[PDB]
Design an enzyme around this catalytic site. Structure first.
Site: not given
Ligand SMILES: Oc1ccc(-c2c[nH]nc2-c2ccc(O)cc2)cc1
Length: 299
Positions: A145, A147, A150, A163, A171
């Site tokens: 994925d 995308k 990510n 990660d 998908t």
């Molecule tokens: O819905 C969201 C997704 C990601 C963020 C985020 C913002 N800074 N870092 C992250 C982050 C979160 C989790 C992880 O596994 C890796 C990175 C916030 C909301």
């Protein structure tokens, strides 16, 4: 400053809830829940991090052992364009992962707002991504994925691959023909997804998209890619080299891997050493919640 020290050691450090201050929930999804947290003590005191919380009930049980692969897959991941696992700890029912906090949103948000990216922006995002994928590959890790959601952006505009899609060597639209043929996700499939992402950023659309799963599947296997004519010959060449149905012929799958990508004419203006060192100025600087770029001024 803490980054140079983590470059000589492998893995996350030990921690516990008392060393973190919770500010807000940044998000929730099928993955779990993400908090904005602040480190209280030690060398990185006051540093903001993203804390992802996973329910242990969701975790896989293998040979009577509840595994923590979301924590362990990140043990050797240490690159500037990928999120770093700083700390990990458990409670009776939860797994807590402390990762980098990125203020500039994700590429999905930028693409949805802007519809499509220029070749300059794509060249920059893809070059940083190729280094991230090559780092995972040298560790026997692939990306299921790959995308826009990510890929996160920092306040400068540099990328950080999350990660979420990490797996040891989803998908359908992002799947390579060999993955559709149930042959397993190899590094060569990552380069096919790299091409799917390239196409989506440049066009705002997906290269192989059918009325149902069967049609998308058969299109990935048999359809000739519809080449957009507003694209440069270098961009078109990169797309046809990444979209080769046979993984052995695909760019990046050769004996020298990522070097085939770096050598491609689409990246001829890229100084790979300056890119690695983040000495290349990102062509887009995202908006952040930070007061300096939200307040209005009348000086
Ligand atoms: O819905 C969201 C997704 C990601 C963020 C985020 C913002 N800074 N870092 C992250 C982050 C979160 C989790 C992880 O596994 C890796 C990175 C916030 C909301």
């Amino acid at each position: 400053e803490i980054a140079i020290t983590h470059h000589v050691k492998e893995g996350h450090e030990k921690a516990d809830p008392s060393q973190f201050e919770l500010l807000k929930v940044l998000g929730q999804g099928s993955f779990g829940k993400v908090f904005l947290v602040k480190k209280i003590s030690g060398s990185d005191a006051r540093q903001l991090y993203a804390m992802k919380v996973l329910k242990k009930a969701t975790l896989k049980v293998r040979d009577r052992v509840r595994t923590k692969m979301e924590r362990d897959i990140l043990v050797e991941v240490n690159h500037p364009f990928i999120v770093k696992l700083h700390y990990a700890f458990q409670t009776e029912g939860k797994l807590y992962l402390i990762l980098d906090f990125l203020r500039g949103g994700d590429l999905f948000t930028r693409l949805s707002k802007e519809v499509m990216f220029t070749e300059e922006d794509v060249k920059f995002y893809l070059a940083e991504l190729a280094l991230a994928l090559d780092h995972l590959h040298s560790l026997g890790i692939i990306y299921r994925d790959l995308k826009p959601e990510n890929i996160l952006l920092d306040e400068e505009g540099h990328i950080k691959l999350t990660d979420f899609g990490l797996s040891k060597e989803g998908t359908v639209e992002y799947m390579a023909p060999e993955v559709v043929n149930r042959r397993g996700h190899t590094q060569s499939a990552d380069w096919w997804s790299f091409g799917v992402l390239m196409f989506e950023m440049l066009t705002g659309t997906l290269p192989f998209q059918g009325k149902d799963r069967k049609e998308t599947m058969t299109m990935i296997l048999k359809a000739k890619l519809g080449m957009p004519q507003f694209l440069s010959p270098e961009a078109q060449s990169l797309l046809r080299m990444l979209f080769k149905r046979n993984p052995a012929n695909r760019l990046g799958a050769g004996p020298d891997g990522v070097e085939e990508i770096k050598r491609h004419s689409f990246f001829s203006t890229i100084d790979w050493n300056k890119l690695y060192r983040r000495e290349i100025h990102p062509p887009f600087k995202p908006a952040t919640g930070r007061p300096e770029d939200t307040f209005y001024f009348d000086p």
